[PDB]
């Protein structure tokens, strides 16, 4: 009644079981879409016993992950199940023979399963284009503490 | 030739099948050959 309607006008799964399950009145009916992107990645416990209907998830959908895999710090928590990760790298300068600092910002999609927080390191995978920016989904989240400015924070992670 | 199609296919099909029973017969046949000396 909550996870289902909640504003939006319906939220099923990829494997349209449900209502039909009432046919198997004895074993386990409460099925949800289960998956495992593999690639050396554990599938979130929370992902399984959730009521969430996120088609853009890498464990609850026919969303693949291929090639490019990222690790970066998180900037913002706003946006619906989407986050911006900031990567901090050095650039070399041919002439002066030294480096300068630089940061690329990245649009990342977050399946409800893992719980966000601002200023923590995150691991993204290469998933098909989900929107103008998005092209990365979160696969493994590590909580971390930064006392204040996320901008000030710059780590060659 | 239309006819010869399903012919050549049945031949290869039964051929494969006939082989499978002989391979599998052996696959399990070596199973007691390997687990016997461990006894």
């Amino acid at each position: 009644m909550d996870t289902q309607i909640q504003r939006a006008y319906q939220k099923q799964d990829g494997v349209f079981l449900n209502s039909k399950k009432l046919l198997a009145k004895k074993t386990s009916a409460g099925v949800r879409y289960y998956k495992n992107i593999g690639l050396g990645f554990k599938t979130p416990k929370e992902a399984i016993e959730g009521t969430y209907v996120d088609k853009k998830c890498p464990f609850t959908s026919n969303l693949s992950i291929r090639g490019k895999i990222i690790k970066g710090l998180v900037i913002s928590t706003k946006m619906n199940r989407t986050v911006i990760i900031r990567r901090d790298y050095l650039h070399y300068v041919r002439k002066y023979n030294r480096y300068e600092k630089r940061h690329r910002n990245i649009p990342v999609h977050i399946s409800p399963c893992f719980s966000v927080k601002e200023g923590d390191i995150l691991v993204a995978g290469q998933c098909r284009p989900i929107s103008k920016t998005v092209r990365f989904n979160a696969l493994q989240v590590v909580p971390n503490e930064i006392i204040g400015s996320v901008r000030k924070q710059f780590l060659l992670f | 030739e239309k006819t010869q199609r399903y012919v050549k296919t049945n031949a290869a099909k039964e051929e494969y099948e006939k082989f499978l029973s002989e391979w599998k017969k052996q696959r399990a046949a070596k199973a007691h050959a390997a687990s016997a000396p461990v006894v």
Binding site: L39, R66, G67, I69 | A12, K13, E15, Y16, L20, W23
Partner: protein
């Protein structure tokens, strides 16, 4: 771009063809076939510049158009100025009963190996993909773009088969595993032949492999570039330029002019 390219430039045509730089401006562009553009040798190249049976361009036009049929590729007739003869193929020159292996050098140039009516029978096939299709049936596919029906089941995807062309029959295969012999179809290391050491898969999207050989050199290349020339040390075909092993520019000198 406008649509699909359709020509080829002297300058741009692969160094494997040991081509004439001054030559012209173009070069026979391989026809869409069994082998990829870069990995192939169009007949016109094969006879004119290679064998040298042909010469001027029209020379070919005769040979492949003449109602006599002078060229055979894997037991079949061919009449296309640029049929892409690829690696591990067998080409027969009718009018002389010549039989050749389409193999790369040790320096990566397409070489023509002369075969005896004996090897001319078998051809080595590498396994592309393997899956079951229509009405419960198993299918295997070879680099040579061969599609196989009901193949022996003990064959993993990255295998190498020996093919009896005469009977379009298979015999003695051999997967790639620690301890075999191999030929590398392309790379900074092509034309080499050694013993597989071990295959470290990295799944992230690209597995690698190592190798040893005669002078026990250490070789490194991606799986897609490994072709199993044989099982357990014994190679299956006669190799060009002696054994599939290249020399230091230093070893070449000492062998030739003995420095």
């Amino acid at each position: 771009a406008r649509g699909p390219k359709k020509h080829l430039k002297r300058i741009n045509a692969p160094k494997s063809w040991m081509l004439n730089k001054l030559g012209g401006i173009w070069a026979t562009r391989p026809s869409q076939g069994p082998h990829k553009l870069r990995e192939s040798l169009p007949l016109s190249v094969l006879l004119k510049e290679r064998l040298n049976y042909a010469l001027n361009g029209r020379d070919v036009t005769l040979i492949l158009n003449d109602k006599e049929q002078n060229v055979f590729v894997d037991g079949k007739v061919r009449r296309d100025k640029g049929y892409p003869t690829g690696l591990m193929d067998v080409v027969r020159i009718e009018k002389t009963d010549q039989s050749f292996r389409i193999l790369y050098d040790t320096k990566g140039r397409f070489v023509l190996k002369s075969l005896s009516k004996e090897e001319a029978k078998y051809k080595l096939l590498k396994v592309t993909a393997k899956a079951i299709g229509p009405n419960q049936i198993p299918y295997i596919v070879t680099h040579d773009s061969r599609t196989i029906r009901f193949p022996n089941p003990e064959i993993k995807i990255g295998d190498t088969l020996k093919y009896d062309l005469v009977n379009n029959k298979i015999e003695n295969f051999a997967h790639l595993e620690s301890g075999n012999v191999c030929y590398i179809q392309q790379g900074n290391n092509i034309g080499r032949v050694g013993i597989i050491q071990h295959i470290e898969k990295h799944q992230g999207s690209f597995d690698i492999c190592h190798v040893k050989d005669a002078k026990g050199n250490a070789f490194a290349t991606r799986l897609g570039n490994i072709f199993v020339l044989g099982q357990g040390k014994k190679s299956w075909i006669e190799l060009p330029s002696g054994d599939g092993v290249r020399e230091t520019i230093l070893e070449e000198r000492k062998r030739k002019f003995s420095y």
